RNA sequence: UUGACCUCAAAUCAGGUAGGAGUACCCGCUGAACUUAAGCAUAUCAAUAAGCGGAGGAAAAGAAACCAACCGGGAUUGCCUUAGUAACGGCGAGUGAAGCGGCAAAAGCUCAAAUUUGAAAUCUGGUACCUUCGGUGCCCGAGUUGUAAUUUGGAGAGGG
RNA sequence: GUUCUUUGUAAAGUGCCUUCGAAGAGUCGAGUUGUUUGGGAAUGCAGCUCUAAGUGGGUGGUAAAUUCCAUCUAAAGCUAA
RNA sequence: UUGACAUUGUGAAGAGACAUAGUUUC
């Protein structure tokens, strides 16, 4: 009966994922994180719906 | 029919005809064994309103049980503990004398199933009961959509578990504010109200 | 009734166009019936009075209805049953040893 | 064992409580299980919905009586008025409650209407076997939602007849309060020899 | 987490921050609320005056609900109308067509008078009012209509 | 003399059934003290441990002698909540539930008490056959001190 | 889904009129003792003594007398989730 | 150990009351 899971306010959860999405633009972050995007066409990288 | 007559007559236990009857019968029983087969209900109107039927695979046993308090056993009255528990002698027992009645004939006829039971008499030493029983492997019973429930295993020794009418009574099984303690059955609801319920996401 | 339509006072509560339900027969679990009247009548005269009933109708004839009630209250459950028992005992008296 | 300026607490942990700790680790499992149960029952239950037409009903007590809410079942009078018997009603996915009573016409009609709508929006396949497969609408609750009845209009004329609300309350409180005492005076002054 | 905790920091000292003289022992002043009228009284009076003894009448089998009656002050009151509609009523403040506010429908049992509503007329439906709430509501040309 | 009945017996009589085990969970019985109260007896630990009888795959509970006091709800069970609250309590230490509301799941019913009386209409068993979890014929038997159909309070029954 | 027997001078549902309308006892309830409960002039359970009625009975969380009101229908019984 | 109540029924004589017919109690 140790606490295993953790409550996080839903809205704070969203703030976080919103921030996280915003950062998937911003090449230097993507670079800093590992990730070999030093020669992708552009960022955000968007691709055909055909995928 | 005559059963309505028998019913009303039976409520006049102070009446001259009935105390003659009470007095002769109660001597006769006391002469017989403490548990004995009864040939036929002696209150046929009572038996049949508790589920009895004059077909084969229905049985009546008459049984006798001592009256009075449960004297707490214990050598010489010694309790070995706190004062609140030093009683020995005004101690009363939570089951009815009729439960004892049932349970003893029930052990005497383990091939049978106790269906129900009723009071017939008493003196100062004993209460006397007739117990009505059903044979769950009699084909007469095993057929019979009305009684073959009693054939399921869930109903073994109902008398030993508090499931006859006497037992549900003493167990306190009744709806309402007066039965909060004892109703979903008391050990179980205690356990309920003393369980710590923790959620993954603590409430 | 009819409720007043406000939130305190005598017939407090919301007004509602109202209906009154068909009676439930349970609700008549008390009632007589020719059969029970007859059978109870008959058994009574088969088996006659009982000891406390016998002391009761003496008490009445010889000591009044108030001292009968007091004793009958002790004998039975309580006071409302004592009222009934004496009443009944009174009618044994009337009907029988009178007219 | 008492110190500092702290609230007095009441932590009932003086019995062998560690023997009755239920941790719901099986929250996810149960949910899944419960979901599978419903999928299963839906399938077994052919095109029938998973639930029964429940009636409208006004909730008990001063606190919730403002709101209206699903009841157990319809009442012999309701069923009758919607033109059916209860034995049949029971087989046609409708809930029937011999215990409930109608004292209230607005609720009675609401309910009868419900039964009309229900009957019109179902189809009852023939007894035989034929089975013209018809696609199951899972709920019935969702299909026939209980709504809260409109009790007025948004704007309207101001009728101020003059006599204050507060004092009507106080007086009404008052009348009640002295009702018995005035009755004793009525009685006692009636026994004017 | 344990990593941020003084007991990691006490490792190596002898007494774990509990002192050499006084020690850390099981239940020095007794357990729980022990001592209340005796060796813990100074703390109990001060911090908890009121604690021992009785006041007032017992009430057997009290059912809160009986007494359910939330308050709303004039303070708010216009809050019980959604804003789009609010401005429409605020301007064109009038008889003939004034807003009906059902304060029971909003879940309130009593209207009270904290302070100042605009001069606009309201029709206020409620179970109870405070003499002031009504006075004020009326001086704007509204009324209270008593419901249940 | 013969033949019943009632009650009571006996059989290596025909066929069956109980025991013991397991026992996490379940239905009951019986029943502590350590402990807490800074001592201690009421209280607490606890309607707990140990002891005893009895079940299942769940058990128990269950179609209201309920809850309410409302515009009333509506079998039972469980979860969230009511609430560390009403209340109990050397009113000390301590203890402590329920009604409403939301949700999981949903399901409802049968006896007794009734003249079939123009027909005991009911049933165990043996037996022969058969299409064998059973059916039919026949025969002993049960049963009127009442076995079927009909009725269960929501009703419902007899007449028209 | 198919297919074969029609069970039947069988069974059931519904509307109006009339008369009926059986409904559980050493129980309910009461005193007292004891135990238990949050349950307090007594929450349940049990022993002993008393022991009902039928427009009755139970309950309505402060004892009692009176008068009403509300609500169920006990002392028998089965039942999946 | 002592009392009351229940187990507990039947006669007869004598006391005891509606207040010198016998229901009732010792
Ligand atoms: Mg036999
Ligand atoms: Mg001991
Ligand atoms: Mg004690
Ligand atoms: Mg089963
Ligand atoms: Mg409790
Ligand atoms: Mg937390
Ligand atoms: Mg706890
Ligand atoms: Mg402890
Ligand atoms: Mg677990
Ligand atoms: Mg559902
Ligand atoms: Mg088909
Ligand atoms: Mg921490
Ligand atoms: Mg760490
Ligand atoms: Mg560190
Ligand atoms: Mg340091
Ligand atoms: Mg340092
Ligand atoms: Mg260090
Ligand atoms: Mg240091
Ligand atoms: Mg320190
Ligand atoms: Mg040290
Ligand atoms: Mg205190
Ligand atoms: Mg405010
Ligand atoms: Mg043999
Ligand atoms: Mg065994
Ligand atoms: Mg104990
Ligand atoms: Mg310990
Ligand atoms: Mg101590
Ligand atoms: Mg100590
Ligand atoms: Mg000590
Ligand atoms: Mg205790
Ligand atoms: Mg044990
Ligand atoms: Mg098994
Ligand atoms: Mg299950
Ligand atoms: Mg079961
Ligand atoms: Mg019923
Ligand atoms: Mg109601
Ligand atoms: Mg319910
Ligand atoms: Mg004190
Ligand atoms: Mg405290
Ligand atoms: Mg306790
Ligand atoms: Mg609900
Ligand atoms: Mg069923
Ligand atoms: Mg009944
Ligand atoms: Mg005990
Ligand atoms: Mg008690
Ligand atoms: Mg009273
Ligand atoms: Mg039965
Ligand atoms: Mg059951
Ligand atoms: Mg003597
Ligand atoms: Mg004897």
Within C 39-78, residues with CB less than 7 Å from strand G: 40, 50-52, 74-78
Query: Cβ distance D53 to D139 under 8 Å?
Result: no
- In whole angstroms, give the CA distance from residue C68 to residue C70: 6
CA distance E61 to chain D (A): 16
Under a CB-based contact definition with an 8 Å cutoff, are residues E114 and E74 in contact?
yes
Residues 51-110 of B with CB under 7 A from strand F: 51, 53-56, 70, 72, 79-85, 91, 93-95, 103, 110
Mark yes or no for CB contact B199/D24 under 8 Å.
yes
Query: What does the buried/exposed string (b/e) look like for B107-123 if buried means 16 or more CB atoms within 10 Å of the residue's CB?
Result: eebeebbbbbbbebbbe
- Would you call B170 exposed, middle or buried from its count of C-beta atoms within 10 A (0-12, 13-18, 19+)? middle
Of D77, B161, B4, nearest to B171 by C-alpha is B161
Note whether C19 contacts D: Cβ–Cβ < 8 A.
Answer: yes
PDB resolution in Å: 2.8
Phi, psi of B100 (to 5 degrees): -60, -35
Cα–Cα nearest to B172, from B156, B189, B157, B160: B189
DSSP of C30-71, one letter per residue?
Answer: T---HHHHHHHHHHHHHH---HHHHHHHHHHHHH-HHHHHHH
B50 touches strand G (CB under 7 A): yes
Residue with tokens 């049932």: B102
* Distinct helix (H) and strand (E) counts, chain E: 4, 6
Residue E125 near residue E148 (C-beta atoms within 8 A)? no
| Neighbour tally for D136: CB within 10 Å | 13
D165 CB-contact burial (10 Å; exposed 0-12 / middle 13-18 / buried 19+): buried
Strand H atom within 7 Å of C54 CB:
yes
Nearest residue (Cα to C1') for G40?
Answer: E60
Chain B: closest CA distance from residue A19 (Å): 25
Using left for φ > 0, alpha for ψ between -120 and 50, and beta otherwise, residue A5 falls in beta
| Bridge partners, B114 (sequence order) | B133
Quick one: tokens of E55?
Answer: 């006041």
Q: Could you give phi then psi for residue D11, rounded to 5 degrees?
A: -85, 95
* Both tokens assigned to B186: 């008391």
Q: Which residues contact D154 (CB under 8 A, 6 or more apart)?
A: E85, E99, E100
* Peptide bond just before A44 cis, omega within 30 deg: yes
> How far is ligand 5, taken at its centre, from the CA of residue B84, in Å?
20
Q: Which positions in strand H are less than 7 Å from the protein's CB atoms?
A: 6-9, 17-19, 23-24
User: B15 and C36 in contact by Cβ < 8 A?
Assistant: no
State the helix-helix crossing angle for C34-47 and B2-9, rounded to 10 degrees. Answer: 50
Protein CA B184 to sugar C1' F76 (Å): 9
3 state DSSP class of E100: strand
- Ligand (nearest to CA of B182): 5
Q: Show which positions of strand G are touched by protein (CB under 7 A).
A: 1-2, 13-14, 20-30, 33-40, 43-62, 64-66, 72-73, 75-79
Report helix, strand or coil for D188.
helix
Residues 114-173 of B with CB under 7 A from strand G: 116, 118-119, 122, 124, 127, 149, 152, 154-155, 163-166, 168-170, 172
How far is residue D36 from each of residues B139, B140, D39, D42, D148, measured CA to CA in Å?
41, 42, 5, 10, 33
Q: Is the CB of E58 under 7 A from strand F?
A: yes
* Distance of residue B7 Cα from the nearest chain C Cα, in angstroms: 10
In Å, how far is B29's CA from the nearest CA of chain C? Answer: 24
Tell me the two tokens of residue D177.
């309060």
Contact yes or no, B with D (3+ CB pairs under 8 Å): yes
Q: Could you tell me if C17 and C53 are in contact, meaning their C-beta atoms sit under 8 angstroms apart?
A: no
Chain C residue numbers with beta carbons less than 8 Å from the beta carbon of B22 are none
Question: How far apart are the two ends of chain C, measured CA to CA in Å?
Answer: 46
Cβ atoms within 10 Å of E75's Cβ, excluding its own: 13
Q: What gap in Å lies between CA D188 and CA B68, rounded to an integer?
A: 56
SS (HEC) of B14-41: CCHHHHHHHHHHHHHHHHCCCEEECCCC
* Residue E124 contacts residue E147 (beta carbons within 8 Å): no
Coil, strand, or helix at residue B144? coil
Quick one: which of D89, D92, D64, D58 has its CA closest to D75?
A: D89
Q: Which residues pair with D22 in a beta bridge?
A: B197
Contact flag B200-A1 (C-beta cutoff 8 Å): no
Supply φ then ψ for residue D69, to 5 degrees: -165, 155
Partnered with residue D58 across adjacent β-strands are D68
Cβ-in-10-Å burial (0-12, 13-18, 19+) of D93 comes to middle
Bridge partners of B129?
Answer: B63, B119
Please report which helix (H) or strand (E) contains residue B197, including its range. strand B196-198
C82 near C69, Cβ under 8 Å? yes
From CA B134, how far away is CA B115, in angstroms rounded? 6
A and E touching (3 or more beta-carbon pairs closer than 8 Å): no
Residues of A in Cβ contact (< 8 Å) with B198? 1
Which nt is closest to the CA of E62, judged by C1'? F86
Those residues whose beta carbon sits under 5 angstroms from the ion ligand 7 are B 196; D 12, 17
Q: What is the C-alpha separation between D145 and D139, in angstroms, rounded?
A: 10
* DSSP per-residue codes, A28-47: HHHHHTS---TT-S-SS---
Contacts of B12 in chain C (CB under 8 A): 43, 47, 50
């Amino acid at each position: 009966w140790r606490k295993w899971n953790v409550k996080v306010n839903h809205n704070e959860k969203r703030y976080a994922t919103a921030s996280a999405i915003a950062a998937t633009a911003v090449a230097s972050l993507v670079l800093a994180r590992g990730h070999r995007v030093e020669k992708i066409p552009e960022i955000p990288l968007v691709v055909s719906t055909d995928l | 029919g005559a059963y309505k007559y028998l019913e009303e007559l039976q409520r006049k236990k102070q009446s001259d005809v009935l105390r003659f009857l009470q007095r002769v019968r109660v001597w006769e029983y006391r002469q017989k064994n403490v548990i004995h087969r009864a040939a036929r209900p002696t209150r046929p109107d009572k038996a049949r309103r508790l589920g009895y039927k004059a077909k084969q695979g229905f049985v009546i046993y008459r049984v006798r049980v001592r009256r009075g308090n449960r004297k707490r056993p214990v050598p010489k009255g010694a309790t070995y503990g706190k004062p609140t528990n030093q009683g020995v002698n005004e101690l009363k027992y939570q089951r009815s004398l009729r439960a004892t009645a049932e349970e003893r004939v029930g052990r005497r006829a383990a091939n049978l199933r106790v269906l129900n039971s009723y009071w017939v008499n008493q003196d100062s030493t004993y209460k006397y009961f007739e117990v009505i029983l059903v044979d769950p492997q009699h084909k007469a019973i095993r057929r019979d959509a009305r009684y073959n429930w009693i054939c399921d295993p869930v109903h073994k020794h109902r008398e030993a578990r508090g499931l006859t009418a006497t037992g549900k009574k003493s167990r306190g099984i009744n709806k309402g504010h007066k039965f909060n303690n004892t109703k979903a059955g008391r050990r179980k609801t205690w356990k309920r109200q003393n369980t710590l319920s923790l959620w993954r996401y603590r409430k | 009734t009819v409720k007043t339509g406000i939130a305190i006072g005598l017939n407090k509560g919301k007004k509602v166009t109202s209906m009154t339900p068909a009676p439930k027969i349970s609700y008549k679990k008390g009632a007589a019936s020719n059969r029970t009247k007859f059978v109870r009548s008959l058994v009574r005269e088969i088996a006659g009075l009982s000891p406390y009933e016998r002391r009761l109708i003496d008490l009445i004839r010889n000591s009044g209805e108030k001292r009968a009630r007091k004793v009958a209250k002790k004998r039975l459950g309580s006071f409302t049953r004592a009222k009934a028992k004496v009443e009944e005992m009174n009618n044994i008296i009337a009907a029988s040893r009178r007219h | 064992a008492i110190s500092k300026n702290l609230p007095i607490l009441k932590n009932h942990f003086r019995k062998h409580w560690q023997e009755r700790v239920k941790v719901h680790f099986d929250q996810a499992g149960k949910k899944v299980s419960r979901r599978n149960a419903r999928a299963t029952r839906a399938a077994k239950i052919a095109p029938r919905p998973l639930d029964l037409l429940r009636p409208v009903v006004r909730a008990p007590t001063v606190k919730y009586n403002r709101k209206v809410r699903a009841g157990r079942g319809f009442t012999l009078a309701e069923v009758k008025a919607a033109g059916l018997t209860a034995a049949y009603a029971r087989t046609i996915g409708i809930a029937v409650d011999h215990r409930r009573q109608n004292r209230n016409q607005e609720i009675f009609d609401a309910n009868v209407q419900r039964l009309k709508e229900y009957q019109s929006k179902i189809i009852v396949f023939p007894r035989n076997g034929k089975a013209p497969e018809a696609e199951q609408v899972l709920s019935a609750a969702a299909t026939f939602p209980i709504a809260q009845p409109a009790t007025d209009v948004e704007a309207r004329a101001v009728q101020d007849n003059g006599e204050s609300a507060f004092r009507t309350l106080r007086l009404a409180r008052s009348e009640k309060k002295f009702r018995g005492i005035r009755e004793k005076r009525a009685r006692e002054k009636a026994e004017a020899e | 987490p344990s990593r941020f905790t003084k007991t990691r920091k006490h490792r190596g000292h002898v007494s774990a921050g509990k002192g050499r003289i006084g020690k850390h022992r099981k239940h020095p002043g007794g357990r729980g609320m022990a001592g209340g009228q005796h060796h813990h009284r100074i703390n109990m009076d001060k911090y908890h005056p009121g604690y021992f003894g009785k006041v007032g009448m017992r009430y057997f089998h009290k059912q809160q609900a009986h007494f359910w009656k939330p308050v709303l002050n004039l303070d708010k009151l216009w809050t019980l109308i959604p804003e789009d509609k609010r401005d429409q009523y605020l301007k064109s403040a009038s008889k003939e067509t004034a807003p009906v506010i059902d304060t029971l429908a909003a879940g309130y049992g009593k209207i009270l008078g904290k302070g100042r509503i605009p001069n606009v007329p309201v029709i206020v439906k409620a179970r109870f009012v405070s003499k002031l709430a009504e006075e004020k509501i009326r001086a704007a040309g509204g009324v209270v209509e008593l419901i249940a």
